[PDB]
Amino acid sequence: SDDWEIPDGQITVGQRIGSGSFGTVYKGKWHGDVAVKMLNVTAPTPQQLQAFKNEVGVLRKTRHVNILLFMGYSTKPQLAIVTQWCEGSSLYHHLHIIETKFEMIKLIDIARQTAQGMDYLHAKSIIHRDLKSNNIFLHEDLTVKIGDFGLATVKSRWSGSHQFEQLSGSILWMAPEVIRMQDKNPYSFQSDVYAFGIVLYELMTGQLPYSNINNRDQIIFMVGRGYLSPDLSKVRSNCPKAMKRLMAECLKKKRDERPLFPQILASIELLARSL
Amino acid sequence: LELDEQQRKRLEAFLTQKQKVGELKDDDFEKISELGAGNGGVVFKVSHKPSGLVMARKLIHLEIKPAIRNQIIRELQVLHECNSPYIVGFYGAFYSDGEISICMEHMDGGSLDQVLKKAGRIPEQILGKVSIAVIKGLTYLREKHKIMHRDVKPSNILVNSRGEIKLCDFGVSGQLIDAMANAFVGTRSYMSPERLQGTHYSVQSDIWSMGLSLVEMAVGRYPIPPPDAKELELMPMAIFELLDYIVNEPPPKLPSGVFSLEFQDFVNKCLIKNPAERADLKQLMVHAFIKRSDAEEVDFAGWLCSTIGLNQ
Ligand SMILES: Nc1ncnc2c1ncn2[C@@H]1O[C@H](COP(=O)(O)OP(=O)(O)NP(=O)(O)O)[C@@H](O)[C@H]1O
Ligand SMILES: Nc1ncnc2c1ncn2[C@@H]1O[C@H](COP(=O)(O)OP(=O)(O)NP(=O)(O)O)[C@@H](O)[C@H]1O
Numbered sequence A: 001s002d003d004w005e006i007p008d009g010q011i012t013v014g015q016r017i018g019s020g021s022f023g024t025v026y027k028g029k030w031h032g033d034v035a036v037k038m039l040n041v042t043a044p045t046p047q048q049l050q051a052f053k054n055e056v057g058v059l060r061k062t063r064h065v066n067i068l069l070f071m072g073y074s075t076k077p078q079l080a081i082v083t084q085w086c087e088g089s090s091l092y093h094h095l096h097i098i099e100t101k102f103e104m105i106k107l108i109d110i111a112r113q114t115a116q117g118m119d120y121l122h123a124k125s126i127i128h129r130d131l132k133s134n135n136i137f138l139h140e141d142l143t144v145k146i147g148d149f150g151l152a153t154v155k156s157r158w159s160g161s162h163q164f165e166q167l168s169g170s171i172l173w174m175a176p177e178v179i180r181m182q183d184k185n186p187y188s189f190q191s192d193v194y195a196f197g198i199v200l201y202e203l204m205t206g207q208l209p210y211s212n213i214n215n216r217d218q219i220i221f222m223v224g225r226g227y228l229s230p231d232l233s234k235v236r237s238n239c240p241k242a243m244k245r246l247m248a249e250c251l252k253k254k255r256d257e258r259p260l261f262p263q264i265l266a267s268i269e270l271l272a273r274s275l
Numbered sequence B: 001l002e003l004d005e006q007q008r009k010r011l012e013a014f015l016t017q018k019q020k021v022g023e024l025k026d027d028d029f030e031k032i033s034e035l036g037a038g039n040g041g042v043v044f045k046v047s048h049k050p051s052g053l054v055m056a057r058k059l060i061h062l063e064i065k066p067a068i069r070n071q072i073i074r075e076l077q078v079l080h081e082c083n084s085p086y087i088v089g090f091y092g093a094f095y096s097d098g099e100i101s102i103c104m105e106h107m108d109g110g111s112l113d114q115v116l117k118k119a120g121r122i123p124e125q126i127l128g129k130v131s132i133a134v135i136k137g138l139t140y141l142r143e144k145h146k147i148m149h150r151d152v153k154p155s156n157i158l159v160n161s162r163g164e165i166k167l168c169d170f171g172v173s174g175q176l177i178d179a180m181a182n183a184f185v186g187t188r189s190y191m192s193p194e195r196l197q198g199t200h201y202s203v204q205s206d207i208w209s210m211g212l213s214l215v216e217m218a219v220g221r222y223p224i225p226p227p228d229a230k231e232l233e234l235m236p237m238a239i240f241e242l243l244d245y246i247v248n249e250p251p252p253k254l255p256s257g258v259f260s261l262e263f264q265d266f267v268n269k270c271l272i273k274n275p276a277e278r279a280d281l282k283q284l285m286v287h288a289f290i291k292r293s294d295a296e297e298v299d300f301a302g303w304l305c306s307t308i309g310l311n312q
């Protein structure tokens, strides 16, 4: 396949929803409700532009129950991304704003489906680079939908033929090797696996990590230094011992100790049965 | 307060216009123009239709739980008590359409961050006048209210055509500071080395930020890392390595040939890494550089309008 490009006059851009680490979302219409994220790189270079078209080729070939559908892009008014529109609130809204109250049965299930979709992405060798509760939606309060995955080339604006990831995103989910931005490609499967483990800390505590550190740069420095770690004492009393141990493996400071998603997902379904 | 007469006139005059303002409503404003943005908000110049007053309006979109948000709005109401000529005038703070509006007085000069762009570098004669304002501003906050800024940087120092210099967006709401802590990475940091490894150590840690800001505005360049050998006679690091440079590398300094010794010394005492050894407000007030720059009669107002493009 090739031209995945939507023309102008086809996307009824609607209300402004919000901005994130690399775009601004509007609820657009396009054969039904879609989500149009106006990228921050509005003026792209034909070297960056062709890498984007190459990465859209992989994202367009993704079909999983736990993955948000990627419906192509546009280059009319300005470079934009068209994805599935999600009803309901994101996981971040449920856990930290609405304070929706789930049982452990439901919480583990959310964690199971998230590993389900994440394992698909790694099976197709796609690094999410942005896994966080903000990019996880509960579709009709049932199915988990992971979004904002991949798209490495529209983050970290290029120079001409270079994409040094000027690290961006939210720091709370960034692995320590991602924080340092030091060796070639900090973003890896284990960098995602760590971010996943932070999502577990969210589900199992109801809190964000480092609830007592209210300094953005203090977290960036101490985490990248190996001084600061998510305080696992904050886990709810009714959390399975098998879950708190899996959580601790994904948060290993050195990335080579963290497990991969085939092993993670197997552990979650096991403790879902012995519950 | 320890002020003169052109200040007691301007101070009391603000409290008058502040009274012509009752309940603040989103519908009582007409948008004029934008003034600036930052990672975590945007500011507009607006007009209060129920009284014609022109104000700045910072809108903070925060995805926070309502219990926390109602605490933030409650905590922000302290800004009504801060009435100093070195603290930006404040009109009110409220919540609407999922956004927190902080309504403050309009400063047609802007932040020293934007002024630094139009100027390139800022003369030491002027930075002396700025240092006096920031030192008195942190003093008023520390003495009359026991609150500290925690974000002294060029973008939070505001100026205007009447030649005033004022601090703003200091940490009055502790809940607001913790909500902003889940923001995306920046590109630079004015955080003192102790705050990166631990927590605030009294007013000394705000002094480091003032010092690092003076060095940037003096040389027209963020000074971490220090300028190159021939970049300097011409007179990008990762966010982590900047923080790592602050914590483990010798503090930045001014060049030896271009600035006075009192100034080089004034910013050196401001940038000592140990917060206890670092100078405090009592010492900086009577420093040689401040003693001199307080005596001089520089035309700050005329220098500003010239630097931007305003009429005399
Ligand atoms: N597919 C979607 N459908 C509906 N709302 C969405 C969708 N994607 C994002 N949003 C919302 O749009 C707003 C901004 O999203 P976004 O730009 O993705 O920032 P973010 O998710 O918070 N961080 P990031 O995804 O890493 O950039 C948030 O309120 C999201 O909940
Ligand atoms: N009262 C005011 N009058 C005029 N300009 C203002 C006023 N308050 C803020 N601004 C401008 O608005 C810009 C952005 O505001 P602000 O929300 O403080 O972002 P910032 O301080 O520059 N960076 P950050 O605080 O980290 O988000 C500033 O750089 C100022 O130029």
Ligand SMILES: [Mg+2]
Pocket: A020, A134, A135, A136, A147, A148
């Ligand atoms: Mg998202």
Ligand SMILES: [Mg+2]
Pocket: B155, B156, B168, B169
């Ligand atoms: Mg500010």
